[PDB]
Symmetry: C15
Subunit: 82 residues, 15 copies
């Protein structure tokens, strides 16, 4: 439909946002979850407390990548320039 | 068949979204799963609890890359510009 | 629908702010959350204390990425130039 | 035959999607599998439980690279542009 | 209503300030907070003292990123050149 | 009997697919196999169970690189463009 | 308004000074703070001594990034050239 | 004796396939082999079992680089384009 | 107001001097301070001796970045060329 | 004798093949050999079994670089293009 | 006053000298100082000997960055070319 | 005296072959030799056995770089193109 | 006052020699000095022996950077070309 | 005198051969030597055996960098082209 | 009295030779020396033997950098081309 410098930059930008935005949170979620299951193996009676604190933490980390997602979707479906 | 800057940028962007988007979650899932199976060996009685928490964690990490896949699929099958 | 150097630079900027801005906080939140759940497994009675300090920590780290998000939203929705 | 910026970008993209897409899952699968076999050596009686959990994990990680494969295959066999 | 070298540089600059500016502090805050919750589990009676010292530390680290935010906001809302 | 942008890109692409595609799986397979032989030395009666789980794991990891090989072979023997 | 090579370089420089300038101090402050809270958990009676030493340390590290802030502020509000 | 972009790209491609394709497998084979000989020293009677699992592992890893070699040989001896 | 190659290089140089110049000293101060507060917890009676040696060390590290600041300030307020 | 893009690329390619191709195998051989001599010091009666398994492993790793060598020699002595 | 390739290179060079020149010495001073205060906590009667050896070591490391400083000051105040 | 693209590429290639080709083997030999001398200290009676296995290993690693040297010497003294 | 490619290259060269030339030695001196003070704390009576070996080591490492300084001084004060 | 692409490439190559060529052997020699002196402290009676094995090792590693020196010297004193 | 491609390359080359050439040996010398002083503290009667083996090792490592220095001095004082 339309191709210019800004449409080209928009699609690259969208991919960088979600692609790069998943690096930190992906690693961090693995580290937290790993400690969680180790803790459960160590003390199964704490499973409830452990899972609750993990779920909360997973949400904070997941939100970081969702910010990248939000930008991607704006660049694609509500682009202010093109 | 159309080739312009933006179609070219779109196909590259699609690949970077899923390619880069798999790095953190891939490493993270491995870390979490490794601790899970170590935990099951340590306390086989807790495997039900461990497996459920692991599954929850894997989902949160898988979703991060799936955001990448959504962007890629938008660029390829619902491209707003080209 | 305007395309120039600045609109293109703006979309790339928006993605870099939130993309790069999640790396450190994503990793850091994972480190903290991991220690939290390991602490809960060690001393389930300290769960309230651990959760409260974790939450406060997660907020400080989340805010770091949110500054990136704010910049991205300004560039997309309140751009001073284009 | 057809050769333009987009066909060239499409073949490079396809390689990057599966090439880069296998890095994190490759490492992660090794980490999880290594811990699985260490766990089986430690508690051979837990082999069934460990193998099931590992299998689930390997699938989650494999899927990440498969999203890359899908993008590659679309680019080579169902290209929307070129 | 304005596009030139310096408007383009300003938007990239704003993103780099807060994007890069969150890497060290993000990682550092995670390290400190992780030790804090581990400390609380170890010695719950010291929670108040630990929490107070952590809060101070988190503020010092958060400030480093805020300096980035300040540069970004000057560039966006009080730009000296454009 | 043919040289253009896309033939040149295709040959580089083929190399990157299998070249980069072997890094993660190569490292991961070494990690898993190392733990497997350490496990066998520790508990030789579990060799069969360890060997079976390792074999499955090696296949999952090998497949990641084979996806690269497949893209490379499509580019060389069934190229869609040139 | 003014736009030339030096204004563009000045805004980028300002971002780099505070952005890159926060990396080492950010990490270092986390390392020191983490050890401080671990020490307080170990010897709560030493909290006053530990907090004083930590505070002095945090100031030394904060100052490093502030030198970056100063350069940034000179560049934006007291630029010698442009 | 033909020289064009594609013959030049082909020779570089051939070298990158086998060059890069040995990195992960080279490292991985070392890791596995190291654990194998350490296992043999710990339990010399398990040598047959350790050797057999090592060999199978080495083959899986060697194959990863061989795919790179195959691509290089196709590019040198059965080039589809030039 | 003068803009040339050298004014542009000067402002960038100023930022790189203090920005890069803070990396090693920032990390180094954190390492030293971390060991100091650990030492005070271990032997509160030695805090006077520990604090003095730490202060001496922090100064030596702070001076390294201050050299960067001197160069930056020369480039901005006593520039020999522009 | 003859100089064109392809002769120039051929000589660079040759050097990259053997140069890069020695990185992984060089490190991996050191790791395996290191474990081997440690194992011999631990259990000198196992020297025969250890050395045999090491020799086999060294051969698999050495072959990875020889693949790079083969490509180099082809590019130099049996070049298909120039 | 004067702007040419060499004045521009001189100011960049000056900043690289002190900026890069502080990386190694900054980290090394932190490592040595960290060990020093740990040693003092361990054996406070050795404070004199420890501090003396540390001071000497700090001087050797500080001199490395001062070499960079010397070059910077020459490039700025005793430039042989411009 | 002839200077063209290919002579220039040849001299650079020669250096990259031996320069890069020494990295993995250099580090690998150090690792293996370090474990060897540690092993001799642990069991002086085994030094004959350790020295022989080390020598075998060093040779395999030295050969990897020698391949680099062969390529370099071919490029300098038996160049097929120039 | 001459400006050409070589004077500009010379000033950059001078800075790179001393800048880069301090990285390894800075880190190495820190490692050695750290072990020295830890050794003095362990055995204060060996202080003379430790100090003497440290000093000799520091000189060897300092000399490495001094070669960089010498090159920088030749380029600034005894330039063979410009 | 002579100046062309090949003389310029030759001087850069010579620097890269010995510069890059000393990285792996430099690190490796330190690793081996460190273990040698640790071993002598542990079993002083084994000093002769350890020193002989170390000497052999240092020679193997030194030779790697010497291959770089040889290429450099050929390029500067026996250049085949220029 | 001379400026061209090769004079410019020669000065950069001289800096890279000694700059890069000091990284590995600098790090390696620190590793070896650190172990030496730790060894002396552990076993002061072995100081002579440790010191002798360290001296030999430091010479081997120092020589690697001297090769760089030699290339640099040839380029500055006995340049074969310019
Ligand atoms: O809006 C841009 C207009 O400018 C064009 O010039 C060309 C220009 O010469 C060329 O350097 C430019 O390609 C170079 C731009 C780099 C691609 C960019 C890099 C990162 C961000 C995503 C992609 O493309 C323009 C085509 O969009 C054409 O003159 C015109 O058709 C086009 O519409
Ligand atoms: O035949 C010209 C066609 O291409 C134009 O874009 C030009 C553009 O101007 C030019 O700079 C560009 O060369 C620039 C190469 C940059 C490669 C780019 C890097 C990241 C993003 C993906 C790939 O080539 C395009 C050729 O397709 C127009 O976009 C298009 O309308 C037109 O159909
Ligand atoms: O600024 C307005 C002008 O935009 C275009 O300029 C563009 C041109 O299209 C583009 O290929 C070229 O891009 C060069 C690559 C830089 C792109 C930029 C880099 C940072 C991240 C955002 C993307 O540079 C020109 C900069 O002026 C065209 O010159 C013209 O169509 C239009 O008037
Ligand atoms: O006029 C439109 C032009 O479109 C293409 O030109 C292209 C040309 O192929 C390409 O090598 C050149 O640089 C293209 C950039 C390098 C290839 C690209 C890099 C990123 C990954 C995908 C592959 O730019 C030209 C456009 O600026 C056509 O191939 C060319 O024939 C034609 O002149
Ligand atoms: O001072 C602003 C000036 O910007 C343009 O000049 C520039 C223009 O940016 C672009 O085409 C080209 O540079 C564009 C590439 C640099 C993009 C930059 C990279 C890092 C910082 C963010 C984005 O060179 C032109 C040289 O004339 C216009 O040509 C000029 O009319 C306008 O006055
Ligand atoms: O579509 C293929 C076209 O390829 C050429 O265009 C290209 C050509 O590749 C080359 O000179 C130049 O780009 C060559 C540089 C890019 C090489 C590429 C980099 C990554 C992928 C592998 C190799 O730009 C030209 C722009 O016209 C020819 O000029 C054109 O006639 C031909 O049709
Ligand atoms: O004639 C003097 C020129 O001065 C500037 O041109 C500049 C132009 O702006 C710039 O994009 C282009 O490339 C400038 C390099 C990219 C921007 C720079 C990169 C490092 C960090 C600071 C930002 O070069 C032109 C000069 O060679 C003016 O902006 C331009 O209008 C004018 O043509
Ligand atoms: O493709 C055929 C043509 O080959 C040459 O093109 C070449 C040219 O020689 C070269 O300097 C230039 O190379 C540009 C650098 C890219 C080289 C390529 C990069 C990836 C790995 C392989 C090497 O690009 C042109 C691409 O078309 C010449 O244009 C011409 O003699 C010949 O007709
Ligand atoms: O309007 C032209 C003015 O700029 C000239 O320098 C030109 C220079 O020739 C040109 O290559 C340059 O574009 C080159 C862009 C390189 C950016 C550079 C990268 C590191 C150092 C800081 C930024 O732009 C300048 C524009 O200011 C002259 O230096 C000055 O006398 C004159 O006033
Ligand atoms: O076969 C290439 C033909 O093309 C030439 O153009 C020039 C071209 O302008 C220039 O960009 C090109 O240099 C740029 C190519 C980059 C060198 C390449 C990069 C990686 C792979 C190894 C080396 O060299 C060509 C010389 O071979 C000449 O026109 C002709 O003499 C030559 O034979
Ligand atoms: O002494 C340099 C003379 O050459 C100029 O050309 C321009 C040239 O076109 C342009 O590529 C060049 O900018 C490119 C040079 C890159 C900047 C350099 C990179 C690292 C070291 C520090 C900074 O700048 C020149 C301006 O100094 C002008 O023609 C003249 O005004 C100037 O005096
Ligand atoms: O005087 C021209 C001579 O050089 C030509 O090659 C040209 C070539 O076209 C040009 O792009 C090239 O500039 C390209 C610079 C690329 C540097 C290259 C990067 C990696 C490989 C080693 C160095 O310069 C050559 C100058 O020797 C021809 O190859 C040769 O026949 C001729 O004798
Ligand atoms: O060598 C003498 C000539 O110096 C200038 O050439 C310069 C030009 O100014 C510059 O923008 C351009 O620089 C290009 C960037 C490389 C700069 C160099 C890179 C390594 C570290 C030192 C800095 O290249 C030309 C190289 O000939 C001008 O051409 C001219 O004013 C003068 O006669
Ligand atoms: O016409 C043949 C040309 O051959 C040389 O030009 C050369 C020129 O020297 C060089 O700076 C330019 O870029 C050369 C690339 C940068 C230097 C090279 C980079 C890799 C490591 C070795 C050093 O390319 C020209 C050829 O394209 C001669 O020096 C020049 O006088 C002559 O114009
Ligand atoms: O052989 C030396 C020749 O050097 C120049 O050519 C060169 C000149 O270096 C420069 O402008 C340009 O290349 C300059 C960029 C390369 C700088 C180099 C990068 C790595 C090594 C250190 C510095 O290309 C010209 C091509 O003609 C002169 O133009 C020529 O008259 C002179 O004879």
């Amino acid at each position: 439909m339309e191709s210019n410098l800004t449409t080209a930059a928009s699609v690259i930008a969208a991919a960088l946002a979600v692609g790069i935005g998943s690096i930190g949170p992906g690693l961090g979620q693995g580290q937290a979850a790993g400690q969680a299951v180790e803790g459960i193996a160590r003390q199964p009676e704490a499973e409830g407390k452990i899972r609750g604190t993990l779920l909360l933490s997973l949400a904070f980390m997941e939100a970081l990548t969702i910010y990248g997602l939000v930008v991607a979707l704006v660049l694609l479906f509500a682009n202010p320039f093109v």
